[PDB]
Each structure stands twice: as C-alpha cells, then as structure tokens.
Design a protein around this ligand. Structure first.
Ligand SMILES: Nc1ncnc2c1ccn2[C@@H]1O[C@H]([C@H](O)c2ccccc2)[C@@H](O)[C@H]1O
Ligand SMILES: Nc1ncnc2c1ccn2[C@@H]1O[C@H]([C@H](O)c2ccccc2)[C@@H](O)[C@H]1O
Lengths: 325, 303, 300, 325
C-alpha cells in the first residue's frame, strides 16, 4: 500500500530491477513527445512532464532518456509523498539532474502546481491494477493536467479467474491471528506466486479506469458480475487477480498469463479467497460478484459467489481489509 | 586562488581581523560529504564568491566554531573531536595546518582564545572543557565540571585565567584557573550563548533557549528582554566606546540592542539560521552576518 | 568470538569511514543518519522551507550493508522532554523523521539516549513509531551505569559533590531505564546499551542490571588504563564486569577518540579479544545447556 | 461522536430537555448582539449569525429569541451535516421560521459560505470538552467568520481528577469483548455517572481551546503534565474528566463539580481508566500525563501515570480508541 505506507529502500530497489517495465515507459513517453511536438517546433516547444509518485527516480530517468531519443525539450517535476525517497531524489537532483528536474515533496492530491502539465507519468498500479488507489491519486492530480494533456498510463483493467487449490485454501486458513475476527484471513486479498493450483476458467475483465477522467464527479465505486464456464469437476477456493495497462497507444504492460509482458517478474498475481470451498460439477457456471467500495477515508473490495451456490458477501464495509486513502 | 572550487552551503562563522579582512567558516551539514572549509576575504563584499577569495582550504570534518589567533592564526572546533590550528602563509595566499589534536571524545562545539593569545579554551558534547597551550600544542588541563553538553565557552577580555562556560545541565560557570576548585556556579531555561562586556570587567550577557537576553554582573535582579522567538545562538558586542549588542537566533533574525537591552535594529534578511555576526573594525556601524542560507549580509546599523 | 562495533559522531565520507572501521576489525558502525549538528525546523517559516537533501542518500551503501553493518544514532539536539514547547514539538517531528529514515534503510538497530529522569515524551514518540508499519528493528537505550551528574569532577567551589552514601540514589539510572520500558509496555524491540565509566559503581548498582535485556555494552577509550608497554588495558574490576557481559553475549561498542595515540586504534579491540580468549572454559553443564539459555519448555 | 456518527432523534430529544443550557446560549447571543450593534444602528445593521451543527433547531430558536429581546436584526444560517436532523430543520423552516433562516445540509468544514458571519454559534462539546472534535470543526469553519467576528463558545477547558473505585475498575474489567485486544477496555474513556467512588485530589485544568484561533497552523495536539496532591491512603483506578466553557464574557457552562452549572443534567463525567490499580500512600503525589493526538483521519488521547509509579502509556497510536474526523 504505497499510499498509506512509506515503502522501504529495498522495496524500491526490487521495483527498479525490472529493465523491461521502464523501457516500455520510455517508449510510451518517446511516442507521446513526438505526437505532441512537430519537428519544426523542436527547439521552441518545451513540454511540461510530471512524474507523479517518483519513488527513487527511475521514471524521471526514463523521461530524460525519452526526450533525448525523441530530440525534444522537456521540463520535469518529480512529485513524491514519501520523504525518505525524497532524500534519494534530492541527492540525484543536486549531483546529476540539475535545474531540468524540480523535486516536489508532496501528496499529488494536495500539491498547488505552479504550471500545468502536457504529460503526467505514473506507476501507481497494484497486482489488481487499482488496488494501490491509482484512480483516486490521479483524480486529485487531474486539475493540473492541461485540457489536451496526456496521462501515462492512459488506461488499466483488472482480470479475475476462478481457481482451485486445497493447498492455498489451507495456507489462508493458517492465517488466523489473535484479537481479530477468526475468519478475517478469508476476507482479504494476498499477493502470491500461485503455483499448486488449477485455473478453472479463462480470466475475464473486472474493473476499468481511464485517465484523464471526463465523467463529472468520477465515481470510482464499481459493481461487476462475472460468469465463468467450468468444464471440469472441481472445488472452488478463490479468484486469481491480474491486470493490463495501456501506457500509450499500443505500448502496454500485462501480468494476465495469456498476454504477460516480456521479462516483467517482480509482479505476482493477487488471490481473493472464499471462506467455504465450493463444489463445482462439469458444465456448471461460477458466477462471482465484485464491488469496489469507498468512503472519504478508505477503499475496499467486497465479493460473493452466487452460482452454483451462494457464499456470504466477503469483506462487508471493509471489516477485514481496507486500503487507506 | 589555489583553494576549493566550491564552499559548503552552511556558513557557521564570520570574524573580522584588525585590518578588516573577513574569515569565514563553513560545513556541509547535508549531501554525500560532511566536511568543512576555511576562507579569507580581503574584500568582504565579494564573500561568499570562491573565485574572489584571498585564500581557502578544505578541512577533513565540519567547522562547529572558529576564532582568530592573532593576525595569521585560526583556531577551529571540529566535528572530529579535534581542536585545530591553521596558519596563513607569509604571502597570505595559503591556509596551512599547524596542529590537529584529537583530544575530545565527541564534537568540539565551542572555542575561545584567552587574554595572552598563547592559550585557548574548548568545550564539547563529550561534557569536558580543556585548556590548551597553543605553542606546545598540548592540553594543559581537562575539566569535567558540567553534567551535559558544553554549549558555549567565552574567555575573559583581560584576565588570562578567567572564562565563562554554559551547558545543557542548566549551569553557567565562572572559571578562575588560579583557584583550587576553579569553577563557581552563577545564579530557568537552558543558557545557550555568552558574551563578556568589553568595558565592565565583571559584567556579561547570556542568551537562552527560549529567546531571552540577560545582563548579569558577577557581584549580584538581572536585566532581561524577550528578544527572539527561538534559541539565542550568539551575542557579539560592537567596537564602540559605548558598545551595541548584536543578538542572533534560530528564528533567522538579527537584533541590535542598547545598554538597557532595548531594540534599535532588526533584520530578517536571512532565510535560515543566523550563525555569526562580526563588526567591522574599519567602519564601526557595519555589522556582517552569516547563515545556513549561504548569505553573507552586510548591515548598516543606526548609531 | 566477540561481536564488536565502533561508535562515531563524525562520518565525513560514509564509504571511507566504513572501510577504515572494518579494517580495524569492527563488525559494525554506530553513526548519525542525519548530521548531528543539522538542527531542523518543521513549524516556523523561513527555516521550515530549507531546501536541498535533508541527509545523504541510501544509494551510498548496498542494502546488505545498511541491514547488517550500520546502527543508527538519534541526533543530540532532539529533546522530546524539553521544558520549551517549540523544542518539544520540533524534537517529536525530528525523532519520527530519523526513526522513519532508519526503518526506510532497514537498519538492524537504532540508538536513543536515556540521559535524564524524565523521558515520558521520548517513550510516547517511540511507542507511536513501534505501532507504525515494519516491526523488525531494535531500539538500544543508551543508559550509563553512573549518571554524568554523579561522576563530575569536584571542581565547583559553591556546588560540592555529595560524599554521603545514597543507596537508592546511586541506582538512579536503572530507574530511568525501568520507567522508560514500563511506559513502552516491555516492548521486545527495546533493549539496553549499557555505558561503562572510568570508575565502576558499588556492586549493588551493577547487580541492579541483572535480568535486564542488555544487548550492548559501551566502552569509552577514556576508561582504559595503560600498561608498561604503552598499550590499552582495563582494571581488574572492569575485567570482572567484561566477563559477566561476555556470558550475556552482548555486543561491545568502542566510543571516543584514540587516547593511546602512539599505539594505533585496533589495540582497544585487540584487548577485548584477549579478555574473550583468556576466560574460564565452559563446564560440562554450560557446554550442554548452550542453546537452551532462558528457552521456556513445558515440564515433561 | 456526533461528527463520525449521525445522532438518533431521541438523542437530540434528550439534549433539548435542558432548559438552562439554551437560556445561557440565548443570554450570550443577546449580550453579543448588543455589544456589536449600537442602538442608533438598530434598524440598518443586520448581523449574520451561523448556527454550526444545528441539530433539530434549539440554538436557531435561541438565536431568534435573543434577537427579539435585544431588539436587533439577524440573518440566520443553520448548518447541519446529519441529513436526518436536516429533515426536522427543513420542516421547521417551511412551517415556522421562513426566509430569516437558511438551512444548509453540509459539513461546516466543506461549506462554501455565500457571506461571512458576525457570530458563529455552536454546541459541539463533549464531557471532556474537545472529545467531540469541536476544535477541528470550528477551525475548518473559521475562514467564513468576519475579521472582527465572535464565536460562541469563545473558549473551553477540560479538567481531570484522580479517582478511586474498585467498583468501577471491575465494571471496566467486565468489558472484555471477543476479537479485540483483551485489555482494550482499559484504553478508552467512558461517559459515566460516577457514584461509588472517591475523588483523590481537586480537579486541575488539562486542555484549553480558543475560538477564533489566531496562532497559524493551529496545532490542536497537546501534551499536559498534572501533579495531584493526595492526602489519603488509597488505590488509584482512573481519572474523572469534566469541562467548563465560556459562551460569552461571564456567561458560562460547567460540569466541574465545584462550579457545576445550575440544573444542567444530561451531562455526566468521563472516566479514563488505568490497566493496573496503583497504591497511593498519604502525602504522595499522583503525576499523570495526557496527550491529545491526531492524524488527518482520527483524533485520540494517550495517557500515563508517572508518579508514585509508572503505568504503561494507555491507547498508544489510538490502538483501542479513536475519534473519527
Ligand atoms: N497521492 C500520492 N502523492 C504522491 N506520491 C504518491 C501518492 C501515492 C503514491 N505515491 C508514491 O508513488 C510511488 C509508487 O507507488 C511507486 C512504488 C514502487 C516503486 C516506484 C514507485 C511511491 O513512491 C509512493 O510513495
Ligand atoms: N463538521 C460538522 N459540520 C456540520 N455539523 C456538524 C459537524 C460536526 C458535528 N455537527 C453536528 O453538530 C451537532 C451537535 O453535535 C449536537 C449534538 C447534540 C445535540 C445538538 C447538537 C450534531 O447535530 C452534529 O451532526
């Protein structure tokens, strides 16, 4: 939860070990800069680029590399709310970047920008796309993007697939802790490298977000019904979650198994367990319902299986799991 | 000028010598390297521009305090625990190390040259006060009188055995090294700065952590004023026959006070902590301040 | 055999310092995470808007080095129990800042002083950091056997040192520790970094620390005696305390400057190794019970 | 917690059963109106009065009665965030009040006022004064009060007194609930009509707030040390909490036993328990430390006894008790 919590130096170090992810962001910025500045305006047109959630600086470096290969002029702002990462950024700014980069130690939702941006670049995505609260963050930052401005990523979609794993069911079961609801461990997602499991139906899209958001008052709350055809006799233990994102045009990133991005390995699927295992016969359909809920303080998911049998609604009112705003 | 290409951001000390040349002390309190530097500006209006200094030198660690030792010597209170003595070459184009003695077990926070100019006093976070012989480069005496960090040590203007010290143990001590028990406790908020009156032998002023400036006479009641909103970092009397008192604070201001401690001048020119003030020996109404904002400000004080 | 660290308050270059310290034979370095003199403002303008990096970059060392070789130290100006409201508030914000940077770096331990009777607000701020995120790091409370006020030279004419026995009075620093850890509700992450002075107190003061979570013993270079050859050694009474601490498997910390100037620095550490090698070999019971010390089991 | 929760119709009904409280508010408004409008300006000067947290309308009625007895002209706004109470207010506005009263269904911290106020009137006080978050609420409403504007109440102070009650200690002890820390019941205050108890020392002031707040960035966080002389042999079980408020000048309200307001009975003391009872000998001093803490989401108290023995710090980081913002 990089919003509610300040990530540790080694966490940012693991993110940065992905060479493919940032070469994709660089390609997206490079194409965008070319589409926004014609060759004749090369030396007069300075594009205002804002890295929103800059961490320890990889997207700042990706933006600079992109501007050099596009042979275009950029003015960068690196916005970061984690003051510990701001130390890394300010040391990079003094030693290497210089005046071209303005480091801002602020929450993007509170920052009074001194200028409007041409492009906002961010990497606020979780294993279930919107689970790190990228929609809320970019919604609050939206007012400082120019009317014709571009957000990278432009869009993202989460995916769900029913899974069978008596091994993982037992693993979740063992997460009972003292001084909390004895069944809370089943009402929360887990980032897990799913190994001993059976995918029971093809992943289907769950929730989609688009940036910039031009549907007044936005409403990031969602309700989705998914019907999964099952061709085997099995036992349902939960839902695997994945995502896809459009950085710019055809430049994308994905952890969906069937369209998985080349060499992008720090990213594991998410698992939504169910309290009671569900017997599924060949030819039956698994119907799941997922909600994205919120108040002014927290965002959470609630979920229920309605076919072949009903489950209880899991995580009502975020009683077991919430994502801090 | 055969000196470092860039001086560190945090200006810690500024002192004019008899001819009007300005000695600056600086440290880098942030970034990769935590060192310091010493600079001489025969043209003080060019300060802090490196390419316009007369001499400059890099020290191994930060400069917490400094002082002139006559006209060519420079005594430094270092972060390393060492008390250093540097000396201007005969051409005054180089600053050469004479001694670097690591005698303190923590940061040396304060340094003061005694009346004779042959001895000095150092105070440290290690809670000790040391009396040094500058020629033999040795500690003559080591005193553990305080019970917390030594904040400030100040040598008497004309008595070579007398000095003042203050500390986070809430003690102001009057020392007289001619006594078997050399310290004596002078009778709220922690004392943070000291300045002996340049004309009145038994009179001194002290600043505290709450912004108050107080006038004290060794005999006895004390005259005081709430001058600053934060800690009183320094107190420097002017060279005039009837001196003015400059006070500087972590509140980023400079105040110039009279005999009754009433305000006559106020400056808010600094954007960070004001660290030192020095009065020009050439023009007595000019007072120079240095701060962590890397500004060398030359104030015209109304007399 | 003996795990030892170097305590410094001056680190001009982090890579050069660590190398010199490792070459001397030390296993770790206790050092400031922010410059110890770099006082910071969080509330009042213009100083609260001070630009530039607030400290040095985490990129200066590998994650493994931050995780295993560096013990953080709280800045000496941070006074959460100050009588001045402004200092108290800036100190709370600075303490939370320094602790959070240590957690960011993944430091194995962080040193905090207990140098006065009232550390109520220091305990409050520490308890609040403990109940915020990553729960791995250790907090070493730097507490002396003998309070500085009770070991000062008798050189103040109008303030003589008390020459009377004050049985409970000489045990005052244990009460500083006791109150602090009571306030923090016996957190297993809060331990003692016991600081040893030139002259040891009475046995009752030393025994007061029995059963206490001592993780480190701080030895200032100034407590070391000199032998006929000019090398640093310790008094028989000090040696007797070192042997007791070796049974608790404490990490030793060497603080202060080289006072044996014409005898090199690793000599202090070479002496600790000598004492460690020249100790009574463990008996049949001690060799048998190795691994079971204070390990609770159900009676068969 | 009337901020985090919407009070029930019968709760507002119990508040309204206090005739003395509102006749005190009416007297405070009456005196303020006379001090702000000279007799000669009687028919030209219309004072803008805002009731902030209007509930079911008693302070609106008190304001109107005050304006009639002062023979002054008023323009009223009744601001209320509870939409259920807003139903009562809007029915009162149509049937009786008319155009003189403008009912605003809003949080006072978000309301874009169309005009600035001369007087802001509120009754946002708990048994420990600031425990219903009156400081935070009035701080956010401050920007729409004129430069020479008056807030009623102008000030409030909480009081603490050490108490002995093995009866109440056992009562708190029995509040252990499933699925929470087994000692959480000792780390939270209770509103209680203290009966079988011993007050061990005179109540002493704890925290003070003043409205309007003219100390930039406010800082509603607080830290107080109290030293209570005890003249008896006893056992310490907790701290009784009370408060006093200055509505205007000499017009006050108090639940402090020694200065208790005449016939103001819906208001019971608050009790801060301690986990472990503390033996106190005659002549010893009880030293307690109280903190008022917050983040952008919650406000809470933390407390500790440091003399004659230390206790643990109670409610660290609001682990057992928080007041929602
Ligand atoms: N509302 C906000 N305003 C300003 N910054 C914000 C937010 C919300 C999040 N972030 C920052 O985004 C980064 C991102 O999650 C990231 C994670 C891991 C590696 C690299 C980047 C983190 O560094 C995080 O601190
Ligand atoms: N930030 C806010 N903005 C708008 N209204 C707000 C707040 C916060 C609280 N209130 C309202 O104040 C009233 C008061 O507590 C009260 C309680 C009991 C009887 C009469 C009045 C309640 O009716 C409550 O809903």
């Amino acid at each position: 939860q990089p919003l509610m919590d300040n990530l540790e130096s080694q966490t940012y170090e693991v993110f940065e070990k992905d060479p493919i992810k940032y070469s994709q962001y660089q390609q997206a910025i490079y194409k965008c800069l070319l589409d926004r500045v014609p060759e004749e305006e090369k030396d007069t047109n300075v594009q205002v680029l804002m890295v929103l959630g800059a961490g320890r600086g990889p997207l700042v470096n990706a933006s600079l590399r992109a501007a050099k290969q596009a042979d275009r002029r950029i003015k960068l702002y690196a916005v970061e709310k984690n003051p510990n990462a701001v130390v890394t950024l300010e040391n990079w700014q003094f030693e290497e970047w210089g005046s071209q980069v303005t480091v801002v130690s602020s929450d993007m939702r509170e920052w009074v920008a001194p200028e409007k941006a041409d492009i906002i670049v961010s990497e606020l995505l979780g294993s279930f796309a919107d689970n790190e609260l990228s929609p809320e963050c970019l919604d609050g930052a939206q007012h400082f993007l120019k009317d014709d401005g571009v957000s990278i990523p432009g869009e993202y979609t989460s995916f769900l697939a029913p899974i069978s794993s008596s091994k993982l069911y037992n693993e979740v079961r063992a997460c009972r802790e003292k001084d909390r609801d004895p069944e809370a461990q089943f009402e929360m997602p887990y980032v897990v490298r799913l190994h001993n499991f059976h995918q029971l139906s093809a992943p289907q899209p769950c929730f989609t977000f688009s940036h910039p958001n031009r549907d007044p008052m936005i409403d990031n709350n969602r309700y989705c019904t998914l019907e999964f055809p099952v061709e085997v006799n099995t036992v349902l233990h939960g839902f695997a979650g994945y995502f896809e994102t459009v950085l710019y045009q055809d430049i994308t990133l994905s952890i969906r198994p069937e369209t998985h991005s080349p060499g992008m390995f720090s990213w594991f699927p998410i698992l939504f367990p169910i309290k009671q295992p569900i017997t599924v016969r060949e030819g039956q359909t698994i119907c799941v319902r997922f909600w994205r809920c919120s108040n002014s303080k927290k965002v959470w998911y609630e979920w229920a299986v309605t076919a072949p049998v009903c489950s209880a609604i899991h995580n009502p009112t975020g009683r077991s799991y919430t994502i801090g705003l | 000028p055969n000196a470092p290409a860039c001086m560190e951001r945090q200006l810690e000390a500024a002192r004019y010598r008899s001819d009007g040349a300005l000695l600056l002390g600086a440290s880098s309190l942030s970034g990769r390297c935590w060192a310091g530097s010493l600079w001489l500006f025969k043209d003080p209006c060019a300060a802090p521009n490196e390419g316009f200094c007369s001499a400059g030198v890099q020290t191994e660690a930060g400069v917490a305090d400094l002082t002139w030792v006559g006209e060519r010597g420079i005594l430094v209170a270092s972060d390393s625990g060492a008390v250093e003595l540097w000396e201007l070459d005969e051409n005054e184009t180089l600053i050469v190390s004479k001694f670097c003695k690591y005698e303190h077990d923590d940061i040396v926070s304060t340094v003061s040259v005694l009346s004779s100019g042959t001895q000095a006093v150092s105070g440290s976070k290690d809670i000790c006060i040391k009396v040094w012989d500058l020629a033999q480069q040795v500690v003559l005496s080591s005193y553990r009188a305080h019970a917390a960090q030594v904040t400030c040590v100040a040598a008497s203007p004309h008595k070579d055995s007398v000095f003042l010290s203050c500390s986070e143990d809430n003690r102001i001590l009057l020392w007289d090294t001619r006594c078997p028990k050399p310290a004596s406790q002078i009778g709220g908020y922690l004392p943070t700065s000291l300045a002996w009156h340049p004309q009145q032998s038994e009179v001194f002023v002290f600043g505290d952590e709450n912004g108050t400036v107080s006038l004290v006479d060794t005999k006895s009641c004390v005259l005081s004023s709430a001058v600053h909103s934060q800690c009183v970092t320094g107190l420097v009397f002017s060279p005039h026959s009837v001196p003015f008192l400059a006070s500087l604070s972590e509140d980023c201001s400079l105040a110039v006070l009279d005999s009754s401690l009433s305000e006559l001048f106020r400056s808010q020119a600094h954007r960070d902590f004001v660290r030192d003030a020095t009065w020009s020996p050439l023009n007595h109404s000019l007072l120079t301040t240095v701060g962590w904002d890397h500004q060398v400000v030359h104030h015209v004080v109304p007399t | 055999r003996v795990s030892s660290g170097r305590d410094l308050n001056c680190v001009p270059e982090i890579a050069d310092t660590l190398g010199a310290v490792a070459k001397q034979g030390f296993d770790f370095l206790c050092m400031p995470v922010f410059h110890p003199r770099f006082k910071r403002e969080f509330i009042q303008e213009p100083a609260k808007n001070r630009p530039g990096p607030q400290t040095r970059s985490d990129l200066l060392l590998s994650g493994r080095d931050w995780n295993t070789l560096i013990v953080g130290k709280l800045s000496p100006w941070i006074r959460p129990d100050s009588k001045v409201e402004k200092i108290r508030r800036n100190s709370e914000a600075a303490m939370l800042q320094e602790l959070n940077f240590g957690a960011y770096l993944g430091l194995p331990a962080f040193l905090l002083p207990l140098n006065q009777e009232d550390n109520t607000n220091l305990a409050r701020v520490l308890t609040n950091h403990i109940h915020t995120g990553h729960h791995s790091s250790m907090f070493w409370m730097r507490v002396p056997l003998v309070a500085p006020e009770d070991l000062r030279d008798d050189i103040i004419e109008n303030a003589p040192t008390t020459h009377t026995e004050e049985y409970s009075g000489e045990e005052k620093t244990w009460m500083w520790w006791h109150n602090f850890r009571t306030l923090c509700d016996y957190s297993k992450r809060i331990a003692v970094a016991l600081e040893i002075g030139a002259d040891l107190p009475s046995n009752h003061v030393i025994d007061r620390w029995l059963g206490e979570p001592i993780k480190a013993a701080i030895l200032p270079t100034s407590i070391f005696l000199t032998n006929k050859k000019g090398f640093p050694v310790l008094s028989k009474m000090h040696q007797r305390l070192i042997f007791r601490l070796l049974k608790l498997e404490v990490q030793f910390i060497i603080t202060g400057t080289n006072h044996h100037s014409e005898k090199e620095f690793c000599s202090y550490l070479q002496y600790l190794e000598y004492l460690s090698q020249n100790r009574p070999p463990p008996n049949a019971y001690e060799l048998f019970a190795k691994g079971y010390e204070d390990y609770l089991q159900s009676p068969l």
